[PDB]
Design a protein around this ligand. Structure first.
Ligand SMILES: [Mg+2]
Length: 1036
RNA sequence: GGUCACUCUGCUAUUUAACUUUACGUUGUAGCUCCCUUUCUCAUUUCGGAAACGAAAUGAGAACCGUUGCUACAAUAAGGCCGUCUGAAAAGAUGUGCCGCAACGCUCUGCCCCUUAAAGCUGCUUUAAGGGGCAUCGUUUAU
DNA sequence: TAAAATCATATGTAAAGTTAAATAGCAGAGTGACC
DNA sequence: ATATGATTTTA
């Protein structure tokens, strides 16, 4: 066959792959083949969006269900008498004054209709119930009075948020309303009715029930049939304390030593004996004259030995719960067998509801103790090793054995249980282990590419993959990194301690967002960074008092990084909406408030990176998934695939820094020429990168002070690039590579590409004259393959609903806010002529404010009668919009634009092609469209399809298409189809931004097309084979 | 001696998946409401008149439609279902009711492509066996 | 004018929480491949 | 990014 090395540059969206032939001494000698697999889809996540849509489906459905149940309950308790309901089960003549009725129920009897309206309104708007284990008289009255005698509206609004009502405040309202209405008569104050209404209002499903944790929990390292153990387990805590104890090291004057058996015995039961065993305390218990330090620590400008080193969190948690419930003496030790401690830790870790926990503990532990435990405990996180393996390992570590010693005595080695069964073809990725569809897709596509090169060229000798790791750093660099991480650790400790201070009643310990809140409270000086008012730290858990605002919105930045979050008031955050602080304070004209906000920012303890981001006034993603893909790939490949290389480790995990340095050392520095083809180039370097070069680079950067991106060292002040030490594979490596990868010659991107075998072979036999091994069998050009998306589902329609009452005309009607009503919108306002004075006044404001609606309508706009008096305020106006097509939604009461076109069917009649667009909602419906696009006309005047039309094929996104238009011949990848125009759009495989519009041929006609035919292509860019459909495919 | 990979532990930073809720936003429908096109009915006032009667203009009042603001109800993908109790059925009662914008895969089905063999035919076709790829198929994924 | 290109404009949003999984890096203990 | 109205250019 042939001996090559396969190199891989894998990203979130692409797999650049390359092959290099090596000799019997495994050096590189020839570039055999290369390609780029682009498997992404048209651009949070798709899975995240799916999850949010599912959650809102469940929310809508559960509210509808409980309101249905409420109407039913009202019927069964005789409140309503079935002359009250209609065909739809709705209540006829249901009054629409429930706030006023909720206020009046404090002072009079209510009509059965009034009282039903009150109950349904309370249950529909039921407020937020805390989910953490732990006027007046009425929120209604209060709302009515201040808000409406003073705000004009009761409900919250987009830019004017006004109230926050607890579910318990509304529960108090409900109870007080039944008590009052029973003072006044109201034969509808049943005990059953009360129970039912209050249960419908208060009930909500648990966040975790049953096996929810177990289905997510991992499995043991050593015995994979067993689940992980919880950290809040006597066995797991004893394991962690034994590993900290056996691995503890005293750095003496010059020598270091492990703890003596006697010292280990002096410490063993210390974390059990007291709340925490700190380093300074252990120091005092150990003798340890002052010229003795601990390997680890920090030993900075703080009391480092005050840091903990161990507390038996679960031991003392259980102990303190039992103590606080008068069941264990504080002085006395905990009185439960370790098996029971493990069982109760596992219980509160796997299960969170009282029901589920008791269902696993009642027969194991005494009901007084279980009562005390449900009350004060919260547990989580689970260590990496099951309880079984830990029960086997921790006794040996009690004896002094190291971690690996015990693991090797018991299981043979401390590497754990690995499945390694070589196969020639990489086995599919388990996908049980990877709950990340983007990572899973990248891994599956890399598998497809690898098994493709194996089906085509046999087994690779060695596979080199580019990871996301960084080169072993200097000793100064990583100690600076350590200082900064340690600064953060101490900030998190201070926040957690502050939180324990203010909230002694909290059950469990602070969670991450809790440390986030208080760490912001610290860095911000205890004030809302938008309003300047101090934050009442006593109520952080009150829903709505303060909210963690993504300063730059998630919908616009997809950013959750700490530098993006500020701690602001609930009202302030919600009025901010999805604006940036710059937009929110209008800092174009430095508003009185934008000057203040900026100042508040500059006087904060924020890092100067966060400060710059909080104020950006400018726009124009994810590498975690990439590193994850790669670590997994390397591990997977090594563990499971046949390789011909000489050694035992035939997979080399590389990283971008080694590729960057080799491209800088070999000439391929490539400022900003980023086009899909480049991923092949990297792959080549990855295949040429070897372990020796890894090691040598690491030595130069760590011990010889080399910068690990530019490749330069500075002596005095010389600035020398270390190019010499890393010879490229062959002399003219750069030139050949550039030609093979990109078609054109290295020096000039200006030249037209060689786009076939003959042109490319001639070009590279010419340019590099001397090297005759450059050309050979496999020197086909680089044609970037793209995965096809032939999936039939997707977003059915856009999410704005528009009025279709005038759809025959060909217009939708949507009510636009004035602050958004720009002057081109105004002339399409519906009452442009019905209300001429209104049109003219709106025009006047827009013209006076240079057509800036936010400034034009910052002052409230009202209508005026003929007498000149002020009348109603205008905050929005219906506006007409063209609508020639759409999706009926919301019980056929509105219409929305199309969102996703699933496929385009092509037919032929008289050597003319026609296009039938099919969208997602039609699949939902089961409709297979009859009419093909006519450019100028609406869909009714489109071409009916019947027996007289020859179906050619169907077309999904990124299917390969060839269109010949006696003006030009074009080949690609289908992207879009224009219903208005009837044309298609195609991506050029390499998305070369010089041809088309950013690499997309927009507006390609296929009506007069000489030839219009669909192709396929493999993972490598090989085997381009046109295919013809036989029978037109249904949609269901 | 170094670098690396992996095992476990503490930590820092970031991300993913799953779940439970809130409040908005949009559309429709109502009630009160703002403007306002049209159309009636009446009044007043000018014109005309032999009479009755007609004509304008203004001002009240309605009504269709448009529609401003507040409140409520319904819907919140398009589309499909499930338990329990009555009931011969028709169907009624009922529920912390369940799915639907992602991904993987090849066991069943559909659908594209390649190889090998056999036979035919003057490059195609049928039978067979194997091998891929994508799915409207199986599953993660159900009351 | 019919068909093909080009330009142009619009896309749902803010929170509260219970969880599990992953990776990059710092540090501590180890084994083994590899330079 | 896609979906598609609105406009200009081309056969
Ligand atoms: Mg915000």
């Amino acid at each position: 066959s042939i001996n090559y090395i396969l190199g891989l540059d894998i990203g979130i969206a692409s797999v650049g792959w390359a092959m290099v032939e090596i000799d019997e001494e495994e050096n590189p000698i020839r570039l055999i083949d290369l390609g780029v697999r682009v498997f992404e889809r048209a651009e949070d996540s798709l899975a995240m969006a799916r999850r949010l849509a599912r959650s809102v489906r469940r929310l809508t459905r559960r509210r509808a269900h409980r309101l249905l149940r409420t109407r039913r309950l009202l019927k069964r308790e005789g409140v309503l008498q079935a002359a009250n309901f209609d065909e739809n089960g709705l209540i006829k003549s249901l009054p629409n004054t429930p706030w006023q009725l909720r206020a009046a129920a404090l002072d009079r009897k209510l009509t059965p209709l009034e009282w039903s309206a009150v109950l349904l309104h309370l249950i529909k708007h039921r407020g937020y119930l805390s989910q953490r284990k732990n006027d007046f008289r009425t929120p209604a009255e209060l709302a009515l009075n201040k808000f409406e005698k003073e705000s004009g509206h009761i409900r919250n609004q987009r830019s004017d948020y006004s109230h926050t009502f607890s579910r318990k405040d509304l529960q108090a309202e409900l109870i007080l309303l039944f008590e009052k209405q029973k003072e006044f008569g109201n034969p509808h104050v049943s005990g059953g009715l009360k129970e039912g209404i209050e249960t419908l209002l208060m009930t909500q499903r648990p966040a975790l029930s049953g096996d929810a944790v177990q289905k997510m929990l991992g499995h043991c390292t050593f015995e994979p049939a067993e689940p992980k153990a919880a950290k809040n387990t006597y066995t797991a805590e004893r394991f962690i304390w034994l590993t900290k104890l056996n691995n503890l090291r005293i750095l003496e004057q010059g020598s270091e030593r492990p703890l003596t058996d006697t010292e280990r015995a002096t410490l063993m039961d210390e974390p059990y004996r007291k709340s925490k065993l700190t380093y300074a305390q252990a120091r005092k218990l150990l003798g340890l004259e002052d010229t003795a330090f601990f390997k680890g620590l920090r030993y900075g400008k703080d009391n480092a030995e005050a840091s903990t080193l161990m507390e038996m969190k679960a031991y003392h948690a259980i102990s303190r719960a039992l103590e606080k419930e008068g069941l264990k003496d504080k002085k006395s030790p905990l009185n439960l067998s370790p098996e029971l401690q493990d069982e109760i830790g596992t219980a509160f870790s796997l299960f969170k509801t009282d029901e589920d926990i008791t269902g696993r503990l009642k027969d194991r532990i005494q009901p007084e103790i279980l009562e005390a435990l449900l009350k004060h405990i919260s547990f989580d996180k689970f260590v990496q090793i099951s309880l079984k393996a830990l029960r086997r390992i921790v006794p040996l570590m009690e004896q002094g054995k190291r971690y690996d010693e015990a693991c090797a005595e018991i299981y043979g080695d401390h590497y754990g249980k690995k499945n390694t069964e070589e196969k020639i073809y990489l086995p599919p990725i388990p996908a049980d282990e990877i709950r990340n569809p983007v990572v899973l897709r990248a891994l599956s596509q890399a598998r497809k590419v690898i098994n493709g090169v194996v089906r085509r060229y046999g087994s690779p000798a060695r596979i080199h993959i580019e990871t996301a790791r960084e080169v072993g750093k200097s000793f100064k660099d990583r100690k600076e990194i350590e200082k900064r991480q340690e600064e953060n650790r101490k900030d998190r400790e201070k926040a957690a301690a502050k939180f324990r201070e203010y909230f002694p009643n909290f059950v469990g310990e602070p969670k991450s967002k809790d440390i986030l809140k208080l760490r912001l409270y610290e860095q911000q000086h205890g004030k809302c960074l938008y309003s300047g008012k101090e934050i009442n730290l006593g109520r952080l858990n009150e829903k709505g008092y303060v909210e963690i605002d993504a300063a730059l919105p998630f919908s616009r930045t997809w950013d959750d990084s700490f530098n993006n979050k500020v701690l602001v008031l609930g009202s302030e955050n919600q009025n901010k909406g999805n604006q940036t602080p710059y937009e929110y304070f209008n800092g174009k004209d430095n508003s009185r408030e934008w000057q203040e906000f900026k100042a508040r920012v500059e006087t904060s303890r924020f890092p100067r990176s966060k400060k710059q981001r909080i104020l950006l006034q400018k726009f124009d993603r994810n590498l975690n998934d990439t590193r994850y893909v790669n670590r997994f790939l390397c591990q997977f490949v090594a563990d499971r695939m046949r390789l011909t290389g000489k050694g035992k480790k035939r997979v080399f995990a590389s990283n971008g820094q080694i590729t960057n340095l080799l491209r800088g050392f070999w000439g391929l520095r490539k400022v900003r020429a980023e086009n899909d083809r480049h991923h092949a180039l990297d792959a080549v370097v990855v295949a040429c990168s070897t372990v020796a070069m890894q090691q040598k680079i690491t030595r130069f950067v760590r011990y010889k002070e080399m910068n690990a991106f530019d490749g330069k060292t500075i002596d005095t002040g010389e600035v020398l690039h270390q190019k010499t030490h890393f010879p490229q594979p062959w002399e003219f490596f750069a030139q050949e590579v550039m030609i093979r990868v990109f078609g054109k010659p290295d020096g000039k991107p200006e030249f037209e590409e060689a786009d076939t075998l003959e042109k490319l072979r001639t070009l590279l036999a010419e340019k590099l004259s001397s090297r005759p091994e450059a050309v050979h069998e496999y020197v086909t050009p680089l044609f970037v393959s793209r995965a096809p998306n032939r999936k039939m589902s997707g977003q059915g329609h856009m999410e704005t609903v528009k009025s279709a009452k005038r759809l025959d005309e060909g217009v939708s009607v949507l009510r636009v806010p004035l602050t958004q009503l720009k002057l081109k919108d105004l002339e399409k306002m519906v009452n442009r002529e019905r209300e001429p004075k209104l049109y003219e006044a709106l025009k006047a404001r827009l013209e006076a404010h240079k057509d800036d609606p936010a400034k034009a309508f910052a002052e409230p706009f009202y209508k005026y009668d003929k007498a000149g008096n002020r009348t109603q305020q205008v905050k929005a106006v219906r506006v007409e919009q063209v609508q020639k097509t759409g999706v009926w939604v919301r019980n056929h009461n509105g219409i929305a634009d199309n969102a996703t076109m699933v496929r385009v069917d092509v037919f032929e009649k008289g050597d003319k092609y026609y296009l039938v667009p099919i969208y997602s909602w039609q699949v939902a419906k089961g409709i297979l469209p009859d009419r093909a696009v006519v450019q100028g006309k609406d869909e009714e005047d489109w071409q009916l399809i019947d027996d007289s039309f020859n179906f050619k094929f169907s077309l999904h996104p990124n299917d390969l298409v060839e269109v010949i238009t006696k003006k030009a011949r074009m080949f690609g990848y289908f992207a879009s189809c224009h219903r208005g125009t009837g044309n298609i759009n195609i991506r050029i495989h390499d998305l070369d931004h010089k041809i088309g519009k950013n690499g997309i041929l927009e507006g390609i006609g296929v009506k007069t097309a000489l030839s219009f035919q669909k192709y396929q292509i493999d993972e490598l860019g090989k085997e381009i084979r046109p295919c013809r459909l036989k029978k037109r495919p249904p949609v269901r």
